[PDB]
């Protein structure tokens, strides 16, 4: 019904030209436009689905894209630049500068392989470096995902794999950020990404978007998410074999205290779903694909993201001057 209004040769705004689709979701649809009004530049535009949810998050991001462009007009920190908005049909669009497919498309497009550990460390140290910024600016993006982090140019090498021939990236989808001094919201973050303190509703701020970062690192490492489940107690079930038990201040506090026998997490080890836990989790270590010394600082880097405190877990100020990102800064 919403496709009714985006067919390719479709022309938006009397300028914006549908060529094709780049991405389509509950969200709405992002289609990639010939900018007739603008020397016939390619241009993305987010077609925003016509429902409560996807409607104030495109107004909040519309709000959130105002303040970080202006704020960074080179783009110096990779946030993706919204160029303007309009409505169309009723539905509310959103222009952007064009980039490439998501850190996922890509390795779905591959057939689930990794990234090679070079480019990981370049994309890492722009992850941190941009969403560094949304935390200087008393921002939290809330909702990292390797589907919100895209290419700017995603052509490839392909040999008996393909490699991206530039590996940097800019993060995108800013309709769930959240200010410092706004009333935090207490379901954040797509299920496979969500902090300890937000399944335990302890309060969260920039520390989650820390977590979200480590569990997207792993998932760049193995080409598999360490945390596939779509259940809070499994979740943190899966979070104790891959990092050992919580600390008891964030059991204690907690108001899900059903979810713990003692100060322990109430989990039949030996049941379908705790069997299933202990095949598909393991220590965190135990992941590495190699003992070389850069797979161990990538790995140091990863724990301290995944640290269960957020307090004590790293900034991502702290995180570039991380050792894994020397190789970076031998130049
Ligand atoms: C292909 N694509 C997509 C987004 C883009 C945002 C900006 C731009 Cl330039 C593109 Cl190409 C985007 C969306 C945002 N924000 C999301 C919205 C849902 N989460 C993933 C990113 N989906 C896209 O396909
Ligand atoms: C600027 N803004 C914001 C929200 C909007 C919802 C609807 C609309 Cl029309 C706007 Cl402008 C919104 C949401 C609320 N309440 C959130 C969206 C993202 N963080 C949580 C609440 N914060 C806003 O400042």
């Not at 021939?165 to 200010?179: E, H, L, R, W």
Request: proline letters at 4%.
């Amino acid at each position: 019904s919403m496709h009714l209004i985006c067919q390719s040769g479709d022309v938006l705004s009397a300028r914006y030209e549908i060529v094709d689709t780049l991405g389509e979701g509950a969200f709405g649809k992002v289609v990639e436009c010939i900018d007739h009004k603008a020397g016939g530049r390619h241009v993305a535009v987010k077609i925003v689905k016509n429902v409560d949810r996807y409607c104030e998050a495109a107004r909040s991001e519309i709000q959130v894209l105002e303040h970080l462009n202006t704020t960074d007009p080179n783009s110096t920190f990779r946030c993706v630049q919204m160029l303007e908005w309009f409505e169309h049909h009723g539905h509310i669009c959103i222009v952007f500068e064009l980039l490439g497919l998501s850190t996922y498309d890509f390795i779905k497009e591959n057939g689930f392989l990794p990234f090679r550990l070079d480019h990981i460390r370049k994309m890492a140290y722009q992850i941190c470096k941009s969403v560094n910024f949304l935390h200087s600016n008393k921002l939290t993006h809330t909702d990292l995902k390797p589907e919100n982090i895209l290419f700017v140019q995603s052509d490839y090498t392909e040999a008996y794999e393909r490699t991206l021939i530039n590996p940097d990236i800019k993060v995108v989808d800013f309709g769930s950020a959240t200010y410092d001094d706004e009333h935090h919201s207490t379901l954040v973050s797509t299920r496979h990404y969500r902090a300890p303190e937000v399944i335990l509703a302890l309060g969260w701020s920039q520390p989650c978007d820390v977590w979200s970062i480590g569990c997207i690192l792993i998932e760049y490492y193995l080409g598999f998410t360490v945390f596939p489940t779509h259940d809070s107690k499994e979740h943190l079930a899966m979070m104790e074999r891959i990092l050992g038990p919580l600390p008891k201040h964030m059991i204690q506090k907690t108001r899900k205290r059903k979810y713990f026998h003692h100060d322990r997490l109430d989990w039949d080890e030996h049941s379908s779903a705790g069997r299933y836990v202990s095949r598909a989790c393991k220590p965190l270590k135990e992941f590495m694909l190699s003992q070389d010394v850069e797979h161990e600082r990538l790995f140091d880097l990863i724990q301290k993201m995944l640290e269960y405190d957020p307090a004590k877990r790293i900034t991502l100020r702290e995180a570039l001057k991380h050792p894994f990102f020397d190789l970076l800064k031998k130049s």
